[PDB]
Paper text:
Each monomer interacts with two neighbouring copies to form a homotrimer with 3-fold symmetry and a highly stable interface. Analysis of the adenovirus loops reveals an intricate network of polar interactions which stabilise their three-dimensional structures.
Most notably, vectors under development include those based on species D serotypes including HAdV-D26, which has entered Phase-III clinical trials as an Ebola vaccine and recently reported promising immunogenicity in an HIV trial. The HI loops of HAdV-D26K and HAdV-D48K are most homologous to those of HAdV-B35K and HAdV-D37K respectively in terms of amino acid sequence identity and spatial alignment. To investigate whether the different loop conformations were the product of flexibility, or restricted mobility we investigated the inter-loop interactions in the HAdV-D26K and HAdV-D48K structures. This analysis shows that the GH loop of HAdV-D26K (like those of HAdV-C5K, HAdV-D37K, and HAdV-D48K) does not extend directly away from the G and H β-sheets, but forms a β-hairpin that is maintained by seven polar contacts within the neighbouring IJ loop which restrict the loops’ orientation. Importantly, no strong contacts are found within the inter-monomer cleft. Loops which can occupy a CAR inhibitory conformation but have fewer stabilising contacts, such as that of HAdV-D26K, should be more permissive to CAR binding. The calculated KD for HAdV-D26K is seen to be more than 1.5 × 103 times lower than that of HAdV-B35K. We demonstrate that HAdV-D26 and HAdV-D48 fiber-knob domains have a weak ability to bind CAR, and negligible CD46 interaction, suggesting that these viruses are unlikely to utilise these proteins as a primary receptor in vivo.
Author numbering:
A (entry chain A), B (entry chain A), C (entry chain A): 186 to 369
Write the structure that this text describes.
């Protein structure tokens, strides 16, 4: 099967600040040697649901995977509705190999003191927009295989960083399309 | 068939200001659970072909679809050369089901007073560039299923919004790649 | 076969300033009527490896192709490891037709004094980020079929243009995803 996703509902599945305070909408569609990805993030409860002037303007969502491409429980995203697509839900409560969706380790090597600088190609940096308002940019940084947390074999992280005061708003961002080279 | 498009010629097919004043170049390629889209817009005649200081710096192009995924005549885009790909033209003068190209209604629900705020994930916001000049950004906003005009079941709209004075130029923008989750 | 690439290693394959001073990481994945592309560029030696205040802040990488979609030797990119994917390397030392990966000549016509202005849709313009640092934007311009150098039938060029002083840094940029309409 060719799509791994969170499902497209709004049921919380993620930790921005506290457990299951947010919905990460993530779809990874296998296109041969690349995955076509689509992501967005919504705070449902907790600090990011009604930001203050002191809420930290830098949020990292970590997906850590094992040797089989299966999500580790220490990830920010819950394993419960992260699986292969079946209709607008997921195939079952199971541990299905997903190595063909994992980021290529040659393109995106793990950090190593071998070389101090990792290659910039391990990241994608762009802007998305808070509240879908054109004057409210948020930087999205997607990083591949840059985590070493908990013995992970692969990782995809999504960081959202900004400078403007978005106090008294709900964190919610426009959708972002991306791709990356896959392992096989 | 896996691509719906306008064809890649420059024959006017769209209304920015007046009927058939512009060429919308749009290609939607089905990649499983996502469409890979590519869009751009050129004013051939009318106000946007030679903008003035008062030309409105906000243009919305609406594609409205019925229950079968077929374009409604009240759309900004003409039905005549919007169809499935056949060579660098289209398969025929016909009404072909296209539900698998439509934006997913769970990911991108229609507006409803049920909840005041629609989800920001229903939009993509980025920049394209007028005249392909790097100092001339134009905001592109792509919105999925946010129209209710004329009983539509689905919609894709492309809005172009800017602040700089582009008077005495022809509206024409760089190409923009995007994706979205599909209905089945 | 459905992917043409440089391979994902870091072995220099490109000229920014001098021959084989850089690694262009480029993957072109055929998705029907579009290619899904992914690019980045790293200076390994030469001026761009340790920029000065006078290093030119505009770098054009040219891929020129013949009638068969095969890379011309006068391109910036070396032919040696540019080929169809086989594992994380390439299929062989050969000249394999690649017309289905070439940019569509109707969408992206060659320049002609027929019409002074080429269509802006022949370019993609966006930002990538030097060193994967969010405060270091670099403009990427991707252009399709705009070269006439050396009798080429098709071309893809990647230009990187910036204004900030990045002296004493190594040129290296985040990855950029794009698509374009193909020839058949």
């Amino acid at each position: 099967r060719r799509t791994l996703w969170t499902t497209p509902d709004t049921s919380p599945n993620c930790k921005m600040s506290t457990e299951k305070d947010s919905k990460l909408t993530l779809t990874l569609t296998k296109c041969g040697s690349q995955v076509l990805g689509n992501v967005s993030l919504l705070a449902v409860t907790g600090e990011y649901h009604q930001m203050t002037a002191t809420t930290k303007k830098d949020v990292k969502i970590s997906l850590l995977f094992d040797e089989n491409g299966i999500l580790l429980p220490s990830s920010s995203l819950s394993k419960d509705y992260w699986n292969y697509r079946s209709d607008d839900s997921i195939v079952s409560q199971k541990y299905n190999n997903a190595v063909p969706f994992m980021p290529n380790l040659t393109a995106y090597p793990k950090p190593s003191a071998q070389n101090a600088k990792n290659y910039s190609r391990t990241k994608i940096i762009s802007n998305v927009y808070l509240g879908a308002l054109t004057y409210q940019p948020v930087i999205i940084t997607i990083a591949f295989n840059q985590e070493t947390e908990n013995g992970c074999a692969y990782s995809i992280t999504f960081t959202f960083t900004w400078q403007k005061d978005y106090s008294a708003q709900q964190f919610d961002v426009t959708s972002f399309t991306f791709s990356y080279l896959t392992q096989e």
